[PDB]
Amino acid sequence: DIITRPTSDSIAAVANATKPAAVVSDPQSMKVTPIVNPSSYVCNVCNARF
């Protein structure tokens, strides 16, 4: 069995105040495509693709 005593209002306010965005969009981002192509999947034994 579990319970959850909610945190005090004060500390919650402080914590929510400081929350930078984890995913920001900027034009200079050092883009790198996937190493393996995610589109096609090849049967490693009979080379049949899907």
Binding site: Q28, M30, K31, V32
Partner: protein, 49 residues
Amino acid sequence: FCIPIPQVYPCITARRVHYAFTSENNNDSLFSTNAASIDTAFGENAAVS
């Protein structure tokens, strides 16, 4: 082939990923760069030969 466009001011360039590049100097067809400007700051600073 992919080539950066020469710029006329010191800019901030993003790190890029390149794969292809030849083995000799096959660049003779290039005539000039930034002809209308006063100087090429970052890119290939080609001038009239």
